[PDB]
Curated annotation (Swiss-Prot), chain A:
Its EC number is 2.9.1.1. SUPFAM superfamilies: PLP-dependent transferases. This is L-seryl-tRNA(Sec) selenium transferase. GO terms for biological process: conversion of seryl-tRNAsec to selenocys-tRNAsec; selenocysteine incorporation. HAMAP family: SelA. The keyword Protein biosynthesis applies. Its cofactor is pyridoxal 5'-phosphate. The keyword Transferase applies. GO terms for cellular component: cytoplasm.
Length: 447, 445
C-alpha cells in the first residue's frame, strides 16, 4: 500500500497550474517519480511528504541553464575546467554580429563565387608568425593528428620518448599520436636524449622529425631545436614542433621574461611547421593553429580528415578579431594578456579592497598573503608569477565545507584550498565581482 | 625592366605620403602587400605602368582595417546556404553564448562534486530527451562524427554499405573520402541502383563490425530490413541522416520524407548522426545519439578529443536545445524562416516595393514563385515564396548584383532573365532600410 501512494503525474499538473509551465512540470515529476520509485524499491524511505517539495526543486533547477558563468578565485588565468581564456566584448561583439545572420564566410564577394574560410584569417597568421602559410583547425589536438596523419601516415616519425609522458595532456595527446596513423620511432629516454639518437633513427621510412612542448625530476637532457632543424635539412626531412601554448610573439615585450616558444621565433629558427592552441596564451577562441612552409600547409589542407576538423563560424569570427587586436597591439583588450600583465602592486590593492569588506562578517579570520603562483594551468608550469591572495578561515566550518557552499551559490565562487584555508587569488578576479563575493559569502553564513 | 622595377618606391616613402592619414602599421602592411604584387607583375612583364599604384595602396588600407568576415544580406531564398554560413542564430542564443564567452564558467567543472567534468554533460540530457536515444555525444561536425563512429567501431573491421553510397557530387566525394580515411574496411554491396537485403547478409562475416546507411537525395532497401538483419547477427546499424533534423517535420505543416533523429531511433537504428547547423538551425555540430555502450565506446576513443567542441558551439547548442524543448520554434531562424506562411511573405515583398518606387529608372515588380529553400541539401523541398523583381534600363542585372555584392553591406540575390530577384524568405526586416539606402547609393552616383 506504500508504493502505490506515489501520486499520478496528472495530479501534480493540477497542483502547478499557472504556477509553472506544464512541460517543465511533467519533466520534474517524471524525474522525481523515478527517484522516489527507487528509494522505496530498496525500501530506503518511509516518507511521501517530500514528493511535492522536491518536484518543485527540479522545476526550480530545470529552468536555469546547465552552463552558468562563475567567479574564478583560483588565480589560474588559463583554467581548463573554467573554460580557458575568456573574451573581450569587442571580440564577442564581432562574433555576435556575424552569428546573427548570413555572412561572407565561404563566399568570395569579388569573384561572386565560393571561397575557403581560412582566407579570412590566413594572412594575419602569416603576418605575425612570419610563416610561409597557415591553416586553422578545430583544436591543437586536431592539429597534431592532422600533421602526423598528413605527413607520415604509414611512414615514420622520430620523436623522443620523453614526449610520450604527460599528466597535463593526460596521455590524450600521446594517445592521439599513437592513433594518428603514423609510425612513431621513439628515441632516447625520459631524461636522456642526444641529437645522435635522433639521427640514428633516420631511415627509408622517415617522414618527419617531431618535437613537443614539455611541462619534476633532477635533470633532463634535451636537444636544442637548432640541432633538429640542422638535422632535418641534412637529411631532407620536415621538422614539426607542437608548441601548444599558442604563444604568438615573444613574452619579453610585456615585461615577462620567460623561456617559451612563440610562433614567430620558432619559424624564424627554421622549424618547418609549428602548431599551437588558440585559447591558451593566445587568449582567443578554441582553435588549432598551424603555420609554416607552404608546400606542407598545402598538403595538410588537402587531407580529407581536415574537413572533419574544420573550424566553426564563431571560433573563426572570434579568432579574426583576436588577431586584428594583436596586429594593432591592443593587448589590454585580450583578457588573458591583460590578467598576466597585471602589476604586482595593483594586485595587493585589490586584495585589501576585499579584506575591508569582510571584517563585518562573524567567525571569520581574514588574512592577505603574497604568493608565487602558476597561472598558466598545469599546461605551462614553467610560468611562475607572484600574486596577492586573500586567505580565510571560519571556526565552525571547514574550508572543505566552506568552498563546497561557495561553489553551490549564485553566482558560484571557485577558489583554491591551502591547509583548511580558503585562498582567493586576485589574479583571476574582476573588480566587479568583489561585492558579489561579500554578498554571497555573508548570505550563506547568515543561515 | 629593372629600370622600370627600380621605379618602385621604398616603403618609407609611402609612409611619408600618408601621415596622420592612416595608422603607420596599416600603411606598411598595405605597402608590402602591394609592392610584392607590383614586383611580380613587372617580372612577368604584365605592367608597363606605375600610375595605378598609390590609389591601390590606399584601397588596401581601407580594406585591411575592416574585418574580412562581414554580415551579408541574403535574398537568395536559400535558408541553408553553405556559402552564406548556413543557419544563423537567434539573439536569445547569441546572448547566452556571449554571456559565457565573457568570463570564466562551469564548462568542464562539476560544481556539485568540486571536480572536473565532461562538457557534454551539459547537453546530453536534452539530446536523449528529444531523440529518445539511450545516450548522446557531440563532435566538431558531422564529418567528424562519421569518421569517429567508424574509426571507433570498425577500425580494422568491416563496415557493410551499398556501393551506391560512394558516389556523391553534393558531398563532392568528401564523405566517402573520410570513410575511406577512417581506418575501417568498407564492404560495398549491390550496385548503384541495385540493392537487395540478402546481398547485405551475404556480406556478414567474422570481421563485420557495423552496417551503415547514408542519406540519399533507383531501387534500394528500407532501413527496417537493415536493423532487422543487424539485430539478427548482432551488428550495430549506423545511419548518417546528416540534415540534423530533430523531430518529424509534419508538425510544422510540411509533409516530406526526411529522417529525423527521434523517428530513426524509434525505428531501432543503433546510432544516428547529423549536422547541428543545418535543419536543427543550431551552431556547427556533429550530433551522435543512440545505444549507450556504443556512445560510451565512442566517447572513450582518443580521437574524440581532437574532435571536441569548443565553448561557444557548446553553449549555443544548449540554448538551441532548450528552445526545442519549449517548442519555441519561432526563435529558431531556420525553422521560423521555413515555417513562414505564404501570406506573411507577400506582405514583406510589398513593404519593400513601397520603399523603392521613389528611385528613378527602376522597374519594380512583385512576384510569387515556388522555390527550393533547403539548399542543395534538401532538393525534394519546394515551397512558395514572394520575391521582389526589379530592373534598370541602363544597367544589366549581371552588373547590378555585381555592384550589390560589392556594397557595404553586401547584398546577394538570384537573377532571372535580367531581373534581380529578392526572395523575402531569407530577408530580415531590419535589412529593408539598408536595401533601399544601398540601392539608391549606387544609382544616384
Amino acid at each position: 500500500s506504500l508504493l502505490r501512494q506515489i501520486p499520478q503525474i496528472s495530479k501534480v499538473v493540477e497542483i502547478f497550474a499557472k504556477a509553472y509551465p506544464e512541460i517543465y512540470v511533467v519533466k520534474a515529476a517524471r524525474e522525481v517519480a523515478e527517484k522516489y520509485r527507487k528509494e522505496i524499491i530498496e525500501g530506503a524511505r518511509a516518507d511521501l511528504n517530500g514528493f511535492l517539495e522536491d518536484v518543485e526543486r527540479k522545476i526550480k533547477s530545470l529552468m536555469k541553464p546547465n552552463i552558468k558563468r562563475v567567479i574564478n578565485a583560483t588565480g589560474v588565468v588559463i583554467n581548463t575546467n573554467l573554460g580557458r581564456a575568456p573574451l573581450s566584448k569587442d571580440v564577442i561583439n564581432f562574433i555576435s554580429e556575424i552569428a546573427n545572420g548570413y555572412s561572407n564566410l565561404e563566399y568570395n564577394l569579388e569573384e561572386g563565387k565560393r571561397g575557403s574560410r581560412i582566407a579570412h584569417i590566413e594572412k594575419y597568421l602569416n603576418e605575425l608568425t612570419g610563416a610561409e602559410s597557415s591553416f586553422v583547425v578545430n583544436n591543437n589536438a586536431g592539429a597534431v593528428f592532422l600533421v602526423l596523419n598528413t605527413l607520415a601516415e604509414g611512414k615514420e616519425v622520430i620523436i623522443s620518448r620523453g614526449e610520450l609522458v604527460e599528466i597535463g595532456g593526460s596521455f590524450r595527446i600521446p594517445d592521439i599520436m599513437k592513433k594518428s596513423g603514423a609510425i612513431l620511432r621513439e628515441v632516447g629516454y625520459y631524461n636522456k636524449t642526444k641529437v645522435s639518437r635522433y639521427e640514428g633513427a633516420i631511415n627509408q621510412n622517415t617522414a618527419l622529425l617531431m618535437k613537443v612542448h614539455k611541462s619534476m625530476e633532477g635533470f633532463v637532457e634535451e636537444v636544442k631545436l637548432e640541432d633538429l632543424v640542422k638535422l632535418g635539412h641534412k637529411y631532407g626531412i620536415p621538422t614539426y614542433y607542437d608548441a601548444g601554448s599558442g604563444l604568438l610573439i615573444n613574452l619579453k615585450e610585456f615585461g615577462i621574461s620567460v623561456d617559451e616558444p612563440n610562433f614567430r621565433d620558432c619559424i624564424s629558427l627554421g622549424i618547418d611547421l609549428v602548431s599551437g592552441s588558440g585559447d591558451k596564451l593566445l587568449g582567443g577562441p578554441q582553435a588549432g593553429i598551424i603555420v609554416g612552409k607552404k608546400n606542407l600547409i598545402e598538403k595538410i589542407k588537402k587531407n580529407p580528415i581536415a574537413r572533419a576538423l574544420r573550424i566553426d563560424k564563431l571560433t573563426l569570427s572570434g579568432l579574426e578579431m583576436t588577431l586584428k587586436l594583436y596586429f594593432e597591439k591592443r593587448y589590454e583588450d585580450i583578457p588573458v594578456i591583460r590578467m598576466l600583465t597585471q602589476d604586482e602592486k595593483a594586485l595587493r590593492q585589490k586584495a585589501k579592497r576585499l579584506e575591508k569588506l569582510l571584517k563585518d562578517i562573524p567567525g571569520l579570520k581574514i588574512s592577505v598573503i603574497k604568493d608565487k603562483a602558476k597561472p598558466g594551468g598545469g599546461s605551462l608550469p614553467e610560468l611562475e608569477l607572484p600574486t596577492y591572495c586573500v586567505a580565510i578561515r571560519h571556526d565552525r566550518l571547514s574550508s572543505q565545507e566552506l568552498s563546497r557552499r561557495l561553489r553551490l551559490a549564485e553566482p558560484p565562487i571557485v577558489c583554491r584550498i591551502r591547509e583548511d584555508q580558503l585562498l582567493f587569488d586576485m589574479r583571476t578576479v574582476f573588480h566587479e565581482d568583489l561585492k558579489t563575493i561579500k554578498k554571497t559569502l555573508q548570505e550563506l553564513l547568515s543561515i
